[PDB]
């Protein structure tokens, strides 16, 4: 009869730190002592993060804190979709959109759902038109409401409060991370240290026995949550678990990010992020109550540092000599194993890929799922590891595939950055997932282990592919074999423009229905 | 490219049938179909056990309701399979002999397994068990079917409401025949009687077309193979390898009957009974006034003879002039299903012995998956490569989780019962034993896709290896750190101990619905 794990470290105080303190403190609810370790470090701005809506669900729902709790407190905006800006067109990079075929270069990823037509994703009866020439629409405009409603900076909530879309949250992670520093230390009982780690002793089987700090404190736990960033204190440094870098599938390392203010009551406030195509990468725009937050994110193998200033302030407008700017070079991949013995890597501890669709925050509190679902016993069953450790790196290979497909697939070929990617080689899994996408089949096509497997799906592949231009081959196979559903789907287009007229019409904008929401 | 046009079905069983049923519904007259069925010697109608989405995923899909094709082909309920013998020695009888105070058998419903704050009900049973605070069985601590299937419940009130989810018991040669009928008459599909003689085949590789007996030629887009064990197209033709899977299962030859039944007598068993004999098993099948049955054995146990003599003195059938069907048959499945334009559907596509009721599924899950990686003329050939890791993977797990059955049972009192124990674990197998061991929930279940991928669940991995005597190593270590939820658990097997009394004592027999239903 082994024993229930009775003491917790976690160590590191941010985002990551913070998110294991709340969500393990809940899940146990005084089964366990949990102490946090966390370092006085430098600050950084807030240069935002943009997520998904099972921050909600799969979240702050698990914690018991409603959507208006927390989100007041944190100043958070609405995010309805990820805008696509000229990944399609050379040039240089600017905040506005060039012409493509007499209209913007802009393509989105709304978290909308595709309407299916006889259990057919609209998707594939869209494409079965431009392939016989009965359209030459965009793929977003044709089959989601949300685009034209977007363009116009609409809310995706009525003033009386009622949802006509998906959405998820753009925020400064400093103040969520302090809101759960608040929840987990007086509601939940984890004990907050500030103090710094220096040195870290295992034991004969290799497991962590004990963390020492600068002030000579002594701390020891059954399990170890390593939430230390990219240094991996716990994991890479004394476990000695190999990182695998990633960087034969993302040629991106680097970032220089800042926070802009912003005039809201002249402007509005966009219900999007914003991915901005760069000379040699691409910048990001998280809108939030009177300011944005942006960075650019590039490849020191194609700009220096220097070069992706100036790049970065030009089009902002910016004073390369005055505006505050944080720099990073940062490692893209994933540990070998995220769990060895008796020690968890969570959050950038663990993997890293760019942000460009909004997973920093997910991989956490998945992972965080995950840990809960495999939660050992002092036996620390071998198999809880191995199925946890499975479970994260596909996680994470999946969306490193995804994210990949964005730049292999755009057709500029303006600068050695943008034809660098393309002499990068798919995973064959990916590869796989294109042959099937060329071949008409609807990849992953629709409770959290569900969004967690399907996180990328027929919807998100045809945003983003048909989006930079790659389509199938041919229709898909089945529609020629009805008839019926393909003269009737005629309806189903109009009624996503009928939607898109009365929406436009009838919704606020977003930046009066936040006021509502605030005073 | 181009559309397919013409589809040709080469054999005309249960498979042939529900291939051209399926396949013509979806293509509503976008494609002419012709099957071609051969005379072929009669067998006695040994019965043949389902599962619940025959209806929900093949029968509503034609559009056909459940009384109207059950009222064609005489079929009886079923509510779950009930093993008999699995974990005491000695000889094939159709009696639970004794183990510890009660009758040796458990179940295997179909009914759904309740969950407790996210946790499945089998995680509580066995924290209890391990407590030392319950000795009862895992089916009858976690599920109200148990305790009426003892009874002979009928799973439907006699005003039709129906308390639990079941599946039917059916000759499948009416079930054949009843499809022959919709198919050619509502559907179009071309029945041809004749014999395939030659296959012809182009330079790729693909059918071009194949000549009968009576020098007839088909010619055709797409070439289905429903021509049972014989694989007249996949295997002889297109010369696709068959991978034999013996050494996961021993079981190779069957010996079967019809027994005549008086249900104003006995009853009607709501389950398929699944008997361990010395050498195999024996299924019981139960229709209306007779049963199926046969002894599944392997060979290299028993002769035929003595497989004819044990399965004979059991039912106290005469072994000299009782009708009986003897088959012997190959274990395992394809290479790949579907080669070049060339698809497997049924017994020339895979075979495993019918110990969970799986043969008649094989069939429409592997049409499912045709129809949606439906080709053009072009095939792409990512369609058949994701087609063949779906059936596959299908295939591969039946066959583990059927091998448990015979590798975790206790018994060691025949070479058979020990052999099985000397056959090794296929690797997915041994990881999913290992997570069960360690207290995971195997694909938690919750349309068939979610039904095709999480076939073998929690549920039905608790209901064997528990039933047979495999339970954890220790609690499922989340319970430890939920001592509200544990302690509130109390109510929920109170509920079903309600359940069980209150059903019990309400429910009609099995026969006495389905009298009334006629
Ligand atoms: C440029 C960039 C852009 C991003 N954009 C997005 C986005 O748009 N949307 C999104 O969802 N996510 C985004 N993310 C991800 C976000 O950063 C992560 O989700 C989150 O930060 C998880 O990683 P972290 O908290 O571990 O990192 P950190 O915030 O760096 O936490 C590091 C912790 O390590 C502790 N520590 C280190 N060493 C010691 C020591 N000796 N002793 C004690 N403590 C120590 C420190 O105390 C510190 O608190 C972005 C990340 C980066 C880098
Ligand atoms: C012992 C046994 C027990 C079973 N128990 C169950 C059960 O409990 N529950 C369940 O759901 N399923 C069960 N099944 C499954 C069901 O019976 C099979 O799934 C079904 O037979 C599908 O395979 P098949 O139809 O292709 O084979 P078959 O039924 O043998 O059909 C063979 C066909 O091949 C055709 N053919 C062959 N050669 C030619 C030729 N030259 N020219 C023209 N036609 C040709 C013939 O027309 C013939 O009809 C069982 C099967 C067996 C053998």
Same mark, same amino acid.
């Given at each position: 009869?082994? $024993? ?8 590191? $105080? ?41 921050? *909600?669900?799969? &979240? ?23 805008? &696509? ?12 959109? +060039? ?40 793929? !977003? ?88 960033? &990219? +240094? ?30 912003? !005039? ?35 490849? #020191? +193998? ?33 540990? +070998? ?29 998945? /992972? ?91 919807? #998100? ?33 109009? /009624? ?20 509502? *929401?605030?005073?």
């Amino acid at each position: 009869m082994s $024993g229930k794990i009775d003491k917790i470290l976690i160590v590191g $105080g941010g985002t990551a730190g913070w998110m294991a303190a709340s969500y393990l403190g809940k899940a146990l609810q005084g089964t366990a002592d949990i102490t946090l370790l966390q370092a006085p470090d430098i600050p950084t701005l807030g240069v935002g993060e943009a997520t998904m809506p099972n921050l *909600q669900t799969a &979240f702050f729902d698990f914690l018991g804190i409603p959507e208006d709790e927390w989100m007041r407190e944190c100043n958070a905006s609405y995010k309805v979709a990820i805008k &696509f800006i000229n990944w399609r067109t050379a040039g240089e990079g600017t905040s506005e959109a +060039r012409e493509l075929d007499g209209g913007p270069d802009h393509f989105y990823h709304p978290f909308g759902l595709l309407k299916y037509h006889e259990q057919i994703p609209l998707s594939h009866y869209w494409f079965d038109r431009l392939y016989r020439g009965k359209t030459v629409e965009p793929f !977003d405009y044709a089959c989601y409401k949300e685009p034209v409603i977007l363009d116009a900076n609409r809310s995706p909530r009525r003033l009386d409060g009622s949802k006509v879309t998906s959405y998820a949250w753009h925020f400064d992670a400093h103040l969520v991370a302090d809101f759960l520093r608040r929840f987990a230390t007086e509601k939940l009982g984890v004990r907050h240290v500030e103090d710094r780690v220096e040195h870290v002793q295992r034991d004969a089987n290799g497991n962590i026995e004990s963390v020492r700090t600068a002030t000579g404190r002594v701390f020891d736990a059954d399990l170890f949550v390593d939430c230390s960033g &990219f +240094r991996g204190l716990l994991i890479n440094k004394a476990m000695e678990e190999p990182f695998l870098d990633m960087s034969d599938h993302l040629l991106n390392d680097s970032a220089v990010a800042t926070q802009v203010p912003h !005039d809201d009551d002249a402007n509005g406030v966009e219900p999007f992020t914003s991915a901005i195509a760069m000379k040699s990468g691409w910048t990001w725009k998280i809108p939030m109550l009177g300011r944005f937050g942006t960075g650019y994110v590039y490849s #020191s +193998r194609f700009a220096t540092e220097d070069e992706a200033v100036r790049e970065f302030c030009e089009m902002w407008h910016l004073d390369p000599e005055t505006q505050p700017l944080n720099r990073i070079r940062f490692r893209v991949g994933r540990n +070998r194993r995220a769990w060895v013995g008796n020690c968890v890597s969570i959050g950038t501890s663990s993997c890293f890929v760019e942000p460009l669709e909004s997973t920093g925050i997910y991989f956490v509190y998945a /992972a965080l799922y995950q840990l809960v679902k495999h939660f050992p016993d002092k036996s620390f069953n071998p198999v809880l590891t191995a199925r946890f450790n499975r479970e994260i790196e596909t996680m994470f290979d999946d969306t490193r595939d995804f994210i990949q497909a964005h730049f292999y697939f755009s057709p500029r070929t303006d600068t050695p950055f943008w034809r660098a990617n393309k002499e990068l080689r798919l995973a064959d899994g990916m590869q796989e997932k294109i042959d099937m996408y060329r071949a008409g089949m609807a990849i992953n096509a629709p409770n959290f282990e569900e969004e967690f497997r399907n996180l990328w799906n027929n919807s #998100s592949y045809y945003c983003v592919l048909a989006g930079l231009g790659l389509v199938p081959d041919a229709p898909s196979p089945r529609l020629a074999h009805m008839p019926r559903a393909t003269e009737s789907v005629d309806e189903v287009f109009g /009624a996503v423009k009928d939607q898109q007229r009365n929406l436009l019409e009838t919704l606020p904008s977003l930046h009066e229905f936040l006021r509502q *929401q605030h005073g």
